[PDB]
Amino acid sequence: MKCSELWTEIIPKNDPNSNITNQVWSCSFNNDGSILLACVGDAILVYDSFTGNLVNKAIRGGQKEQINCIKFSKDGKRFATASNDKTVWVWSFDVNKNPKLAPEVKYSHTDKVLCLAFNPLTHQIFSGGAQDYALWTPDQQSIEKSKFKDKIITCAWSWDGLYLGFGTMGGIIGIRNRALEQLAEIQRSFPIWCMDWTPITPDYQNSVLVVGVWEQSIAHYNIQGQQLGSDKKLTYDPIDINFSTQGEFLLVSGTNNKCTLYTREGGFLIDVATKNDWVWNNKLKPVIKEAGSVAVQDQLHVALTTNDGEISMFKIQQLTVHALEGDKYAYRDNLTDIVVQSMSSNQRIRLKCKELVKNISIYKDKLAAHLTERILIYGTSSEDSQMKYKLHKRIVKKVEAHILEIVSNHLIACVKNKVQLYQLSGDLEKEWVFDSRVNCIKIIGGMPNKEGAYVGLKNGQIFKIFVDNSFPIPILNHNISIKNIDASQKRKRLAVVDKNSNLTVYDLSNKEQVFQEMNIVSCAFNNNFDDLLAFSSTDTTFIRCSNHPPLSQKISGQVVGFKANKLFVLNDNVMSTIDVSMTQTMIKYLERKEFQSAYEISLLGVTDQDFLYLGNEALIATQFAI
Amino acid sequence: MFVFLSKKIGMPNNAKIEAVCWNKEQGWIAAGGEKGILKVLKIEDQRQKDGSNPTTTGQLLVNNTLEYHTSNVYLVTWNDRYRKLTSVEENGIIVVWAYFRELQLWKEEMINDRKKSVVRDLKWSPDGQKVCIAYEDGAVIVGSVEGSPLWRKEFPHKLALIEWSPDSKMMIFGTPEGEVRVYDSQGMEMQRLKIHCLQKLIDPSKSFSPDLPLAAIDWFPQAKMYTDDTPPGLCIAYQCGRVQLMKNEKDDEPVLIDTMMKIFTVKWNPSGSMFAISGTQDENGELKGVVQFYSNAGHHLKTLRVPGSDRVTGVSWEGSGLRIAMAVNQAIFFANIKPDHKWAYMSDGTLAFAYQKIDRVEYTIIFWDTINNKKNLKFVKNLCCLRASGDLCCIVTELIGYDLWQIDLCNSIGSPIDSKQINIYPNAVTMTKTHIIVCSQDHVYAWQYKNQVERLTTFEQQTGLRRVGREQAWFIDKENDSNNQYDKDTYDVEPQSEDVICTVAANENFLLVARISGTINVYTFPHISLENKLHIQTRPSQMSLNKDATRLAIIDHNGNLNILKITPQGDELLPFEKKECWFVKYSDDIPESFVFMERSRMYIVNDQTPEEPIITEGYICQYKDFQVKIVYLDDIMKSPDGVLRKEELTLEIEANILKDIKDQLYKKSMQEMFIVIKQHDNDCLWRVYAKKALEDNDFDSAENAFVQCKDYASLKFLQRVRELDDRERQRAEIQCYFNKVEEAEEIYNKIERRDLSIQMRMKLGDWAQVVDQIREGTGQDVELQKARLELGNYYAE
Amino acid sequence: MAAKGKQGWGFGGKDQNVKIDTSQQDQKKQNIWEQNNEDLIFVPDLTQE
């Protein structure tokens, strides 16, 4: 969701009165991603992906003309440099060897070379220029050159290694086999610039050709040449098309000087950068997953090349949105997915959407999915232990809100400094306007059409909202901005955290700062005893009772929920349950002769030995009922 | 895992056996002979009822010969979807049979034969709907089950080996010269595989076409073919040399395995956990028939050697994968396999069982209560180790991508408590009453989860510094002194020692660490410091520690077992022999008695005096007082409908001492048994004597047993009972005292006077039952109202 | 015996294809601990535009 620049290297060596320019055309990326390439007029540039610095000095004089394309070999061992000198060089590459790069095999066409592609499996080279296309096989070292009628502009080998696809500015798209025969021909009326093959996938296991035409369209073509009928329209003319690994994303660049991201279906997600100029080539960092590896893999890396001569690197990080009400934990998986996990049996349930999910809120046996310009609601069959989800209703209305919640027969959306109440049909019902941005909102239970809520503002004043009152009730005031709020089981106290990670406990009956704590990341209240408060810092979690010394665990994670003899700890995006011994508070309560509260604490599932000890203590002190 | 031998089916007519096929759904093993001798028969069950079969089975259920052939047969294939059986000869005659519901009669249904050609390898599709037939000429014929020929193509290159993909979409060819080619289902060439396995043997210039013939290529079915994050599922072996494993056909980084044998046949597991390679080995100085088992990653788990000095050709697995049929010369040997079967047993009675899914990556843990018959389930992605203690269980799992291992504790239900993370590879893990010790190849890690007396050292607020609940980690070679608290980033693992460790044992105050060279190091728990250095000739494998730490049992890698007496800087080996032992366990109550099980035979040994063996096909759970608990995990794996009964799985075996004591009790009088029990003076014997005395309604003997047991509550109970008048209230109260309230209620109903029943039910604290009893019984308003108020309070709490 | 006794899969000259019955089908029942692997159920989204 957040896109941050990493490192930028600019090439200002413009040379007027010379055909060599400062533009950059292509940027090849290694499969591992430890090395990066770029091509400039009369030179090549080698970069480190993580930090921007030339590992090797710029090579000059090898090709007397510009460099049109640079590609790897899917194994990080070969170079292919095509130049306007009517020649293609193939270099050997190896990081550990003293010569990191050195020319290996050079050949030449009859005219200038324009595009080049590699074979993922057999590592064969297909180079297409004006009037000619050539195929090179490493084993035989004998090139096969053939003539054409117009200059090919783009080529791409299928991930199966069997098919080949090329495009011409005359509008002709040709699909051939490894023997270079006219398997399929398609005639269009606009030039062809960008082509790609969809990656193989166990869910799909079929390869189709995605080609971006200059009539503001992207088309999907089958092997036989029959179009799939998508013909998705675009506002801008595309220039480059790149598919992420496993066929999950699609990076599209071109006119309007913007680099945008899309799903494979065509749903817009975000834009990466606006370079104020045409972006000739953008590439995505490949990723390698181990056998059964566990990782969120939220991080993404892109490399962009602009027409001015800037080779920039951007890092995209996806934020975490999740919801937890009871016995269920619904969190957003890899984008366009919702996973509901049960804390007891660790079983998961997956719901797949096509557009990006923005907010997930779960009420009693009701799950609300907030898709782009769509709202979905799913229910649960309570009688069966396993949950069955069925779509009762769908909302087509477009609603924008950074926070969305669902209550019985109503929906609440927070946008800017306003709160909107939506009926399930879709029509707006009620409005609330506050001075500053509404940061955090908490929903408390109640009757249908009468559910209250707490609202925190950027100023810090904490307000209460009722559905039918339409008049905010000022609860209290806080000087610093509010980040998160919580309410006690009996609505007796309220814990509020400021932007400085400062935790404060306010009594509702008497507005007084009873408790203050520094460096607090999260906090939670018990749902059965109403008194225990568990707050987690960056490394240590503390549980505190009434007028008692704190207890430390050195538990790695953040506290999300507290239930009877249970604490939920969430690390990264997976969470677990930890049991807590209640003997310490038992003994402390026994010290002050408060047998009722001690028995209430003991009722939270303590060992039978402590039950016997409490029974003996109560019997000695003449308390026969306990 | 362990492997041993079993029944040996004899020669049919003194003819060599070279092809054996075992069905998966029903048990029908077939062997081919020399002069057209095809025999299909059923095999004896491994476990029958809950004991040894009086007839010992010993009956060949079918055992019928289907000859029809004058020449020899060397390809016999079973259809698993249907009853079809395919068999070919040297003269290119392919015959397909089917089963008709008559007196075990198989008759021909396909009689096809192509002349002037030689058949090499026939294959069936995993779905069972296609047949691929290839010859040495090059022609490939694909036929449906019905009989319609899909296509009969001709190939220029000669063909030697045929394999099918799990999805049957495409196939793999291997030429006699040696090379792998990928073809589609329509006979079109896709590509040629590259071999990195054969190093220094191939021609340096070209590697696609070496001069080494292919032994066997095998693709494990039910495995993903369009993914990269999966354990390897395809294997390619050459005639004698290296074998390579690939997780996919397009993989360019295969896993290498080298074995010093002539590979003849490689067969995968029904579950895919391990694969067996059969053939001949010359390491013993001559030709010895061997079968080597390898994991999916490849670790050479075990090696089975046949008594005969000859070849081992043809290996088949049972449907469940518990038995192996191996055709050696003129016999079909049956090898029995006992897998690892990660399982844990608590003193609560809960049993934790780990089951592997078909993904081979994910595991399911079942917590089954042996008393209340409850069943809870948990899903754990990766499992490395599972261990149990009196009331807690330890799970050691691995996180991929961080090279870390998570060790967590779980109660009977399975709620995690105080999970920790380490960077130490769990080569060998143990967990005693108050510690958890995990040992890598060269590092040792200890962690305290309980304090000195009895309490969890996770919630403590007294001293600023860490007093109880500290984690230590040290080296094996040097740095004997224990280090301070380690971290997942501060601690270093890079240094390596020449003498690696193999097994570790723990006690209440002692720790033992073994070494491969034959050295055992002793450590004390209050402050870790080496004291003794024991010497053992052979490397230990399992090891065990006796209560009080007086003796120990050493099991060698070859299976030999002996007893070692631990003494200050000494070495005493008590002569016991008893080779080929597999399981050993010392009693936790009797300092001397122990149980060891050898080749599916259990022996109870005390003071180096063994007893009669007992045939058992289960695993030993615990050795409690004069009792051994065994559980059959194989039937747990094979449950029909999801009900587990403690009367079927769990079995209890009593020692001869307890049996003799019970016999003398049920036969002889009371005073003689009292003086007989006096010498033994054991808690269980006194408890049983008191129970019997109370059952016969005798109080004097019960009082004597209770004073000898030193139990004040029992004396108070007996004193309360003795002041009674009738004969019925005493029995009912005794029944309620033991564990049984229903019997007491029934006898109360027999004697009527239900107010005692209602008062006892109120006293015991069950409020639903008294509410049920009072309804429509007497109509008492006040009692019913009070009972309902108490029930409401109980439900609210 | 050779109840049918006819060349199959197009091996002879004269077309003499056989008919083999495919009525008795043997299937393997999945284990219940294995049958609990499907807890991760797939739910597509209702795409009616």
Numbering used by the authors:
A (entry chain A): 1 to 626
B (entry chain B): 1 to 797
C (entry chain F): 1 to 49
What does the paper say about this structure?
Intraflagellar transport (IFT) trains, the polymers composed of two multi-subunit complexes, IFT-A and IFT-B, carry out bidirectional intracellular transport in cilia, vital for cilia biogenesis and signaling. Here, we purified the IFT-A complex from protozoa Tetrahymena thermophila and determined the cryo-EM structures of the IFT-A complex and its subassemblies at a resolution range of 3.6 to 8.8 Å. Analysis of these structures reveal that the apo IFT-A complex is composed of two rigid structural modules, the head and base modules, and presents two distinct–elongated and folded states in solutions, the latter of which was not identified in recent IFT-A structural studies.
In particular, IFT144, IFT140, IFT122 and IFT121, share the same domain organization, from the N- to the C-termini encompassing two tandem WD40 β-propellers (WDs), an array of 12 to 20 TPRs and, except for IFT140, a zinc binding domain (ZBD). These four subunits are distributed into the two modules; the head module consists of IFT140, IFT144 and the C-terminal half of IFT122 (IFT122C, 706-1246), whereas the base module consists of IFT121, the N-terminus of IFT122 (IFT122N, 1-705) as well as IFT139 and IFT43. In contrast to the head-module elongated conformation, the base module adopts a compact configuration. IFT121, IFT122 and IFT139 together form an enclosed oval-shaped ring with the N-terminal TPRs of IFT139 (IFT139N, 1-694) extending out in a solenoid conformation. The short linkers (~5 residues) between the WD40 propellers and the TPRs in IFT121 and IFT122 constrain the locations of the propellers right atop the IFT121-IFT122 TPR junction to form half of the oval ring. This conformation is stabilized by extensive contacts between IFT121 and IFT122, which bury ~3130 Å2 solvent exposed surface area of the base module. On the other side, the ZBD of IFT121 fits into a helical groove formed by the TPRs of IFT139, constituting the other half of the base ring. Notably, the base module oval ring is sealed by the very C-terminal residue of IFT139, Lys1334, whose aliphatic sidechain sticks into hydrophobic central cavity of IFT122WD1. A salient feature of the base module is that, IFT43, the smallest subunit of the complex, adopts an elongated configuration and traverses the base as a molecular tether to stabilize the ring-shaped architecture.
